[PDB]
C-alpha cells in the first residue's frame, strides 16, 4: 500500500491553523516523487533529514500536519520562531526532525469580497507548547474585570479571521502548509521509501 499523500496535499479544504489537522501515516510505502516533480512549492525545508534522500529512508511513524496561514507567517513554521502563529497557533519544537512544505493557495482559498472562513488565534495569555492545539473559544480577559462570556471592552473573542482576497499581496495571500514529522524509535519501521523496503 502506498502512503496517503494525496488526501493531505490534494485536499479540497485545509484546516484553520488554530485547529490544525494531524494525520498519522503508518504501514505504507512513501514515494516523494509526487512532491519532487511538482514545482509549485514555495518552501521545502527539512530538519534532521535531507529533502533529496527521503526516498531512501524509513521511519517508525510519520505525522502529517496541515493548515492555512499567510505567506508572511510561513517563516514561523520552523524551530525557535516567534509570532502569533508560532506562539499561539502552531509551535514546532527545537528538536524537530521532519520537513516543512508550503505552497501558495490564492487560487483555492481566496474570495472576491473576502474569504473569512480561515481563522487564527489572536489572544492568548501564554505561549503554546510544541505540537499543541488550542481549540478553545472562551472570551479573552484583557483587564481585571471578568467577562462572563460577554464580549466588550477588554473582553474579546480569541480567534480572528484572515482576510483572503485575490487582489491581496503575496504576504497577505493564503499559503497551504504541510508539516511532516519523523520519529525513529527502537520499534519496527512502518513508513519506508521505494528505494528501501
Amino acid at each position, epitope marked *: 500500500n502506498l502512503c496517503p499523500f494525496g488526501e493531505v496535499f490534494n485536499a479540497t479544504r485545509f484546516a484553520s491553523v488554530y485547529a490544525w489537522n494531524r494525520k498519522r501515516i503508518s504501514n505504507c510505502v512513501a514515494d516523494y516523487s509526487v512532491l519532487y516533480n511538482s514545482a509549485s512549492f514555495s518552501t521545502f525545508k527539512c530538519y534532521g533529514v535531507s529533502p533529496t534522500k527521503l526516498n531512501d529512508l524509513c521511519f517508525t511513524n510519520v505525522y502529517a500536519d496541515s493548515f492555512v496561514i499567510r505567506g508572511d507567517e510561513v517563516r514561523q513554521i520552523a524551530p525557535g520562531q516567534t509570532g502569533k502563529i508560532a506562539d499561539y497557533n502552531y509551535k514546532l519544537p527545537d528538536d524537530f526532525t521532519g520537513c516543512v512544505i508550503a505552497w501558495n493557495s490564492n487560487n483555492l482559498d481566496s474570495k472576491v469580497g*473576502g474569504n473569512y472562513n480561515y481563522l487564527y488565534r489572536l489572544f492568548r495569555k501564554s*505561549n503554546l507548547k510544541p505540537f499543541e492545539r488550542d481549540i478553545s473559544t472562551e472570551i479573552y480577559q484583557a483587564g481585571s474585570t471578568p467577562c462572563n462570556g460577554v464580549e466588550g471592552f*477588554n473582553c474579546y473573542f480569541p480567534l480572528q479571521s484572515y482576510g483572503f482576497q485575490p*487582489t491581496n*499581496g503575496v504576504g*497577505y495571500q493564503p499559503y497551504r502548509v504541510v508539516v511532516l514529522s519523523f520519529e525513529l524509535l527502537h520499534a519496527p519501521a512502518t513508513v519506508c521509501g521505494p528505494k528501501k523496503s
Partner: antibody
Amino acid sequence: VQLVESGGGLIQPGGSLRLSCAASGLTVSSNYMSWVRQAPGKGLEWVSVIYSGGSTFYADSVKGRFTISRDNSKNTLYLQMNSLRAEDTAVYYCARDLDVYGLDVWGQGTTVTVSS
Amino acid sequence: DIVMTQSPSFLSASVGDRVTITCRASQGISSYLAWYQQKPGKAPKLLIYAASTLQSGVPSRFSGSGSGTEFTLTISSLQPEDFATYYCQQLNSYPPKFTFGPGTKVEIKR
C-alpha cells in the same frame, strides 16, 4: 482606562533613557503593548511591541539599542533606549495594540530630545 | 515594504461639507486599514478599524470604505471638532508591525 507616561527629557547622543507607561483599566501582561514615536513635524512610526506571551519585536531602526519590558506588579510598560542618536528625537507614545482592531488606548506621550 | 499614501495633504472645508480623504497602498492589504484623528499636541484617536467598522464612541458621521489598494474616510457633515489631521494605518504588516500614512490636515475655510 488610561496610560500615564513618564521618563522623557534631554539627553546627549550615545546616552540612555528609560521610558515608563503606567496602566489603569487594562492589564499590560495580558495585552499587546506597543511603543509608537512621532518626530516633530513628521508622522508616526512603530518602535517596539511586547506580546502577552513575552515575545518582543523591534523596528530595524532601533533593534539592538532598544529593549521593551514590563512589570506585572506595577502594571507598567518600559522602553529602555540606549545608544541614542539625533534621529530618535520624537514624542513617544505607549499604546494598547488590538491588532486588526487598531490602537484604541493611547498615552499622553513623552518628549525625547537627543542633541549635543 | 508596502507603501502607504494619502491625498490630499491639506484640505479646506466648512462646517456641514461632505469630506472625503483617500488612503492608498502599493499592494493589496485587504481590509487591514485603520483610521486615526490627531489634534495638535494630543495623541492619535482611533476612529475606524477593519477599514469599515466604526470604533465605539465615534460619531456616525465618520464612515470608512474600500478594500485592497484604495480606502476612503468620509465625514458626512463636517463639525467644528473634526478640524484636525487624519492618518491611515496598514495592519499586520511585515517587516514592521504597522505602517502609518503621511496624514491629511483638515482646516477651516473662509
